[PDB]
């Protein structure tokens, strides 16, 4: 609504790894056949159709925007898991938080080595 | 960890073990040579110290 | 299960980072030396 009415919005799904679990429970109780790790087949779609709504409308469509900051939770840093990889291949950037950095004193634990942002140059003030 | 983590760690440790075995062999050869060359130098240096402990 | 060349830096454990640093420090030093020599040659070859 906000992005369609020329305003700017920010949405923070927290977590998406629990929406995936709720969807899996629904799908298993409707008797739909399971998939990998028991998640339904349509588990990528579930998220891709949801994170694709965070657009940046041009000035003809109001100019409004909707940023999204999905939050995923990995297991012992296994970024290679199923839902983490799906959402990593869906989103633009990433912000890797690591426990080894959290306890080494670096807080926020952002792992600047791996954290990425496709926009990069653009969307940054000239001084910064 | 997962299977790939364990596989990579196992391969790395196997390489490390190979390298340390090779280095042990090299060090043993160099040690044998060093002992062989140390005997005469042992007598030579002990002689050179002779004076001070005698006077 | 076997082992292959260049596996210590594929795991990326402690030995991988240790080796990467042991390489980078040495080659930074040699690059500094070579740059000094390059500057000296530049100056000595102007004439």
Swiss-Prot record, chain A:
The modification N6-succinyllysine is found at residue 7. Mg(2+) binds at residue 14. The modification N6-acetyllysine is found at residue 7. Acetylated on lysine residues. BLOC1S1 is required for acetylation. The record marks 115 as: Required for activity. It is found in: Mitochondrion inner membrane; Cell membrane. Heart muscle (at protein level). Heart and liver. Subunit alpha, of the mitochondrial membrane ATP synthase complex (F(1)F(0) ATP synthase or Complex V) that produces ATP from ADP in the presence of a proton gradient across the membrane which is generated by electron transport complexes of the respiratory chain. ATP synthase complex consist of a soluble F(1) head domain - the catalytic core - and a membrane F(1) domain - the membrane proton channel. These two domains are linked by a central stalk rotating inside the F(1) region and a stationary peripheral stalk. The siderophore enterobactin (Ent) produced by enteric bacteria binds Fe(3+) and helps bacteria scavenge iron ions from the environment. As a consequence, the mammalian siderocalin LCN2 plays an important role in defense against bacterial infections by sequestering iron bound to microbial siderophores. LCN2 can also bind iron bound to endogenous or nutrient-derived iron chelators and plays an important role in cellular iron homeostasis. Belongs to the ATPase alpha/beta chains family. Homotrimer. Component of the ATP synthase complex composed at least of ATP5F1A/subunit alpha, ATP5F1B/subunit beta, ATP5MC1/subunit c (homooctomer), MT-ATP6/subunit a, MT-ATP8/subunit 8, ATP5ME/subunit e, ATP5MF/subunit f, ATP5MG/subunit g, ATP5MK/subunit k, ATP5MJ/subunit j, ATP5F1C/subunit gamma, ATP5F1D/subunit delta, ATP5F1E/subunit epsilon, ATP5PF/subunit F6, ATP5PB/subunit b, ATP5PD/subunit d, ATP5PO/subunit OSCP. This is ATP synthase F(1) complex subunit alpha, mitochondrial. The chain holds residues 299 to 426 of 553 of the full protein.
Swiss-Prot record, chain B:
It is found in: Mitochondrion inner membrane. Signal peptide: none annotated. The modification N6-succinyllysine is found at residue 24. Disulfide bonds: none annotated. The modification N6-acetyllysine is found at residues 14, 30. It comes from the Eukaryota. Subunit gamma, of the mitochondrial membrane ATP synthase complex (F(1)F(0) ATP synthase or Complex V) that produces ATP from ADP in the presence of a proton gradient across the membrane which is generated by electron transport complexes of the respiratory chain. ATP synthase complex consist of a soluble F(1) head domain - the catalytic core - and a membrane F(1) domain - the membrane proton channel. These two domains are linked by a central stalk rotating inside the F(1) region and a stationary peripheral stalk. Component of the ATP synthase complex composed at least of ATP5F1A/subunit alpha, ATP5F1B/subunit beta, ATP5MC1/subunit c (homooctomer), MT-ATP6/subunit a, MT-ATP8/subunit 8, ATP5ME/subunit e, ATP5MF/subunit f, ATP5MG/subunit g, ATP5MK/subunit k, ATP5MJ/subunit j, ATP5F1C/subunit gamma, ATP5F1D/subunit delta, ATP5F1E/subunit epsilon, ATP5PF/subunit F6, ATP5PB/subunit b, ATP5PD/subunit d, ATP5PO/subunit OSCP. Belongs to the ATPase gamma chain family. This is ATP synthase F(1) complex subunit gamma, mitochondrial. It comes from Bos taurus. The gene is ATP5F1C. The chain holds residues 26 to 80 of 298 of the full protein.
Curated annotation (Swiss-Prot), chain C:
Changing residue 26 to A: Strongly impairs F(1)F(o)-ATP synthase-binding. Changing residue 28 to A: No effect on F(1)F(o)-ATP synthase-binding. Residues 1-20 are annotated as: Disordered. The record marks 19, 42 as: Participates in pH sensing. Changing residue 27 to A: Strongly impairs F(1)F(o)-ATP synthase-binding. Residues 1-20 are annotated as: N-terminal inhibitory region. Changing residue 32 to A: Strongly impairs F(1)F(o)-ATP synthase-binding. Changing residue 19 to A: No effect on F(1)F(o)-ATP synthase-binding. Signal peptide: none annotated. Changing residue 22 to A: No effect on F(1)F(o)-ATP synthase-binding. It is found in: Mitochondrion. Homodimer; represents the active form and is present at a pH value below 6.5. Homotetramer; represents the inactive form and is present at a pH value above 7.0. Endogenous F(1)F(o)-ATPase inhibitor limiting ATP depletion when the mitochondrial membrane potential falls below a threshold and the F(1)F(o)-ATP synthase starts hydrolyzing ATP to pump protons out of the mitochondrial matrix. Required to avoid the consumption of cellular ATP when the F(1)F(o)-ATP synthase enzyme acts as an ATP hydrolase. Indirectly acts as a regulator of heme synthesis in erythroid tissues: regulates heme synthesis by modulating the mitochondrial pH and redox potential, allowing FECH to efficiently catalyze the incorporation of iron into protoporphyrin IX to produce heme. Belongs to the ATPase inhibitor family. Forms an alpha-helical dimer with monomers associated via an antiparallel alpha-helical coiled coil composed of residues 74-106, leaving each N-terminal inhibitory region (residues 26-62) accessible for interaction with an F1 catalytic domain. The inhibitory N-terminal region (residues 26-62) binds the alpha(ADP-bound)-beta(ADP-bound) (ATP5F1A-ATP5F1B) interface of F1-ATPase, and also contact the central gamma subunit (ATP5F1C). This is ATPase inhibitor, mitochondrial. The lineage of its organism: Eukaryota, Metazoa, Chordata, Craniata, Vertebrata. The chain holds residues 33 to 79 of 109 of the full protein.
């Amino acid at each position: 609504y906000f992005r369609d009415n020329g305003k700017h919005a920010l949405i923070i799904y927290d977590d998406l790894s629990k929406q995936a679990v709720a969807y899996r429970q629904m799908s298993l109780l409707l008797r739909r056949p399971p998939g990998r790790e028991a998640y339904p087949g349509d588990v990528f779609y579930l998220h891709s159709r949801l994170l694709e709504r965070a657009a940046k409308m041009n000035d003809a469509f109001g100019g409004g925007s909707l940023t999204a900051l999905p939050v995923i939770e990995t297991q012992a840093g296994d970024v290679s898991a199923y839902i983490p990889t799906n959402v990593i291949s869906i989103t633009d950037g990433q912000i890797f938080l690591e426990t080894e950095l959290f306890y080494k004193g670096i807080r926020p634990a952002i792992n600047v080595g791996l954290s990425v942002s496709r926009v990069g140059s653009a969307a940054q003030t000239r001084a910064m | 960890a997962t299977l790939k983590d364990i596989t990579r760690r196992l391969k790395s440790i196997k390489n490390i073990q190979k390298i340390t075995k090779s280095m042990k062999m090299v060090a043993a050869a160099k040690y044998a040579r060093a002992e062989r060359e140390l005997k005469p130098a042992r007598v030579y240096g002990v002689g050179s110290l002779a004076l001070y402990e005698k006077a | 299960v076997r082992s292959s060349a260049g596996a210590v830096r594929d795991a990326g454990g402690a030995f991988g980072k240790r080796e990467q640093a042991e390489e980078e420090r040495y080659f930074r030093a040699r690059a500094k030396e070579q740059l000094a020599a390059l500057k000296k040659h530049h100056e000595n070859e102007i004439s």
